[PDB]
Design an enzyme around this catalytic site. Structure first.
Site, PDB file in Angstrom:
ATOM      1  N   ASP A  73       8.742   1.974  -3.148  1.00 34.40           N
ATOM      2  CA  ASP A  73       8.145   3.250  -2.750  1.00 34.40           C
ATOM      3  C   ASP A  73       8.981   4.397  -3.313  1.00 34.40           C
ATOM      4  O   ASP A  73       9.965   4.817  -2.695  1.00 34.40           O
ATOM      5  CB  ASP A  73       8.045   3.323  -1.228  1.00 34.40           C
ATOM      6  CG  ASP A  73       7.221   4.494  -0.745  1.00 34.40           C
ATOM      7  OD1 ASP A  73       6.864   5.369  -1.564  1.00 34.40           O
ATOM      8  OD2 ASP A  73       6.923   4.531   0.467  1.00 34.40           O
ATOM      9  N   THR A  74       8.579   4.915  -4.476  1.00 33.96           N
ATOM     10  CA  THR A  74       9.304   6.020  -5.093  1.00 33.96           C
ATOM     11  C   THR A  74       9.144   7.325  -4.319  1.00 33.96           C
ATOM     12  O   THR A  74       9.908   8.266  -4.555  1.00 33.96           O
ATOM     13  CB  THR A  74       8.843   6.224  -6.536  1.00 33.96           C
ATOM     14  OG1 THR A  74       7.431   6.472  -6.566  1.00 33.96           O
ATOM     15  CG2 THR A  74       9.165   4.994  -7.382  1.00 33.96           C
ATOM     16  N   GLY A  75       8.175   7.402  -3.407  1.00 35.26           N
ATOM     17  CA  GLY A  75       8.012   8.573  -2.570  1.00 35.26           C
ATOM     18  C   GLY A  75       8.862   8.591  -1.324  1.00 35.26           C
ATOM     19  O   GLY A  75       8.869   9.590  -0.599  1.00 35.26           O
TER      20      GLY A  75
HETATM   21  C1  LIG Z   1       9.754  17.144   3.608  1.00 32.92           C
HETATM   22  C2  LIG Z   1       8.353  17.283   4.296  1.00 32.92           C
HETATM   23  O1  LIG Z   1       8.417  16.916   5.643  1.00 32.92           O
HETATM   24  P1  LIG Z   1       8.965  15.401   6.080  1.00 32.92           P
HETATM   25  O2  LIG Z   1      10.384  15.450   6.375  1.00 32.92           O
HETATM   26  C3  LIG Z   1       8.651  14.126   4.680  1.00 32.92           C
HETATM   27  O3  LIG Z   1       7.484  14.462   3.972  1.00 32.92           O
HETATM   28  C4  LIG Z   1       6.958  13.347   3.259  1.00 32.92           C
HETATM   29  C5  LIG Z   1       5.694  12.628   3.785  1.00 32.92           C
HETATM   30  C6  LIG Z   1       5.128  11.424   3.022  1.00 32.92           C
HETATM   31  C7  LIG Z   1       5.811  10.945   1.769  1.00 32.92           C
HETATM   32  C8  LIG Z   1       5.244   9.738   1.024  1.00 32.92           C
HETATM   33  C9  LIG Z   1       5.646   8.461   1.803  1.00 32.92           C
HETATM   34  N1  LIG Z   1       7.078   8.468   1.927  1.00 32.92           N
HETATM   35  C10 LIG Z   1       7.761   8.280   3.221  1.00 32.92           C
HETATM   36  O4  LIG Z   1       7.152   8.080   4.223  1.00 32.92           O
HETATM   37  O5  LIG Z   1       9.219   8.346   3.205  1.00 32.92           O
HETATM   38  C11 LIG Z   1       9.901   8.449   4.452  1.00 32.92           C
HETATM   39  C12 LIG Z   1      11.142   7.368   4.432  1.00 32.92           C
HETATM   40  O6  LIG Z   1      12.024   7.906   3.586  1.00 32.92           O
HETATM   41  C13 LIG Z   1      11.832   9.459   3.730  1.00 32.92           C
HETATM   42  O7  LIG Z   1      11.612   9.999   2.607  1.00 32.92           O
HETATM   43  C14 LIG Z   1      10.263  10.894   2.715  1.00 32.92           C
HETATM   44  C15 LIG Z   1       9.789  10.775   3.940  1.00 32.92           C
HETATM   45  C16 LIG Z   1      10.518   9.626   4.578  1.00 32.92           C
HETATM   46  C17 LIG Z   1       5.248   7.194   1.026  1.00 32.92           C
HETATM   47  O8  LIG Z   1       5.763   7.264  -0.240  1.00 32.92           O
HETATM   48  C18 LIG Z   1       3.723   7.052   0.937  1.00 32.92           C
HETATM   49  N2  LIG Z   1       3.140   6.801   2.309  1.00 32.92           N
HETATM   50  C19 LIG Z   1       2.674   5.424   2.598  1.00 32.92           C
HETATM   51  C20 LIG Z   1       3.848   4.547   3.041  1.00 32.92           C
HETATM   52  C21 LIG Z   1       4.291   4.933   4.473  1.00 32.92           C
HETATM   53  C22 LIG Z   1       3.422   3.082   2.993  1.00 32.92           C
HETATM   54  C23 LIG Z   1       2.254   2.755   3.967  1.00 32.92           C
HETATM   55  S1  LIG Z   1       2.127   8.055   2.921  1.00 32.92           S
HETATM   56  O9  LIG Z   1       2.591   9.391   2.542  1.00 32.92           O
HETATM   57  O10 LIG Z   1       2.135   8.119   4.373  1.00 32.92           O
HETATM   58  C24 LIG Z   1       0.424   7.715   2.246  1.00 32.92           C
HETATM   59  C25 LIG Z   1      -0.023   8.355   0.917  1.00 32.92           C
HETATM   60  C26 LIG Z   1      -1.427   8.053   0.375  1.00 32.92           C
HETATM   61  C27 LIG Z   1      -2.374   7.109   1.163  1.00 32.92           C
HETATM   62  C28 LIG Z   1      -1.935   6.497   2.438  1.00 32.92           C
HETATM   63  C29 LIG Z   1      -0.506   6.790   3.004  1.00 32.92           C
HETATM   64  O11 LIG Z   1      -3.027   5.674   2.933  1.00 32.92           O
HETATM   65  C30 LIG Z   1      -3.855   5.510   1.863  1.00 32.92           C
HETATM   66  O12 LIG Z   1      -3.592   6.700   0.923  1.00 32.92           O
HETATM   67  C31 LIG Z   1       7.095  11.669   1.239  1.00 32.92           C
HETATM   68  C32 LIG Z   1       7.653  12.863   1.994  1.00 32.92           C
HETATM   69  O13 LIG Z   1       8.113  14.896   7.433  1.00 32.92           O
HETATM   70  C33 LIG Z   1       8.212  15.640   8.624  1.00 32.92           C
HETATM   71  C34 LIG Z   1       6.819  15.928   9.153  1.00 32.92           C
END
Ligand SMILES: CCOP(=O)(COc1ccc(C[C@H](NC(=O)O[C@H]2CO[C@H]3OCC[C@H]32)[C@H](O)CN(C[C@@H](C)CC)S(=O)(=O)c2ccc3c(c2)OCO3)cc1)OCC
Lengths: 99, 99
Positions: free
Chosen positions: B25-27
């Site tokens: 997960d690069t995100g």
């Molecule tokens: C800074 C802004 O505020 P913030 O601090 C963080 O904002 C962010 C919010 C989301 C992300 C992207 C997310 N990364 C993430 O969760 O990382 C966590 C852990 O490590 C930290 O790094 C960043 C956050 C922490 C995943 O890459 C992708 N996800 C799925 C994944 C969970 C697998 C099921 S998904 O987005 O939910 C999603 C996308 C398309 C879809 C879907 C579901 O279903 C079908 O299509 C990155 C930053 O949050 C406070 C409110």
């Protein structure tokens, strides 16, 4: 190009005639963009991740240019904290993971 | 190897002697695994995703082998929808994005 992962993989995208910064996210099935007033019809949808689900608007056959590479597909619009380029568009620009 | 994104980039990982399936997960800045028992001390922490914040247990300097590649870093454990390998460990195994 090659993007290392020391920092967030942020790139410039072009959509609806606007430039934005978005995250190349291999963990995202779909592309989720910050609130914007795209024209045309849409369908309600909910997508889930860490923390729960958010409500989004599904627009189809939307063109996006990512680092000069063109891609067209479904884009979800809603209260996302970050613009997220998902696999549905990453595949179209030839993006791979390598190690 | 080179991994395309037409399907989820799922790989087998080994942590605490147990095999599991996880998403590259690069995100994700951090690595977050579903509920499990891990030895050693841990501190409560909180992380935010698409739909809000969750409470996790932070384990530091944990051995984890990802698709044959060893890493030693921070692993968060909590109610994540799926096991996700974040950039903190992707960098350790030399993972890059390429298009
Ligand atoms: C800074 C802004 O505020 P913030 O601090 C963080 O904002 C962010 C919010 C989301 C992300 C992207 C997310 N990364 C993430 O969760 O990382 C966590 C852990 O490590 C930290 O790094 C960043 C956050 C922490 C995943 O890459 C992708 N996800 C799925 C994944 C969970 C697998 C099921 S998904 O987005 O939910 C999603 C996308 C398309 C879809 C879907 C579901 O279903 C079908 O299509 C990155 C930053 O949050 C406070 C409110």
């Amino acid at each position: 190009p090659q993007i290392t992962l020391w920092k967030r993989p942020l790139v410039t995208i072009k959509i609806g005639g606007q430039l934005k910064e978005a995250l190349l996210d291999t963990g995202a099935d779909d592309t989720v963009l910050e609130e914007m007033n795209l024209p045309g019809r849409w369908k309600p949808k909910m997508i889930g991740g860490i923390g729960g689900f958010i409500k989004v608007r599904q627009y189809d056959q939307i063109l996006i240019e990512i680092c000069g590479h063109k891609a067209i597909g479904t884009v979800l619009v809603g209260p996302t904290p970050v613009n997220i380029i998902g696999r549905n568009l990453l595949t179209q620009i030839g993006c791979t993971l390598n190690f």
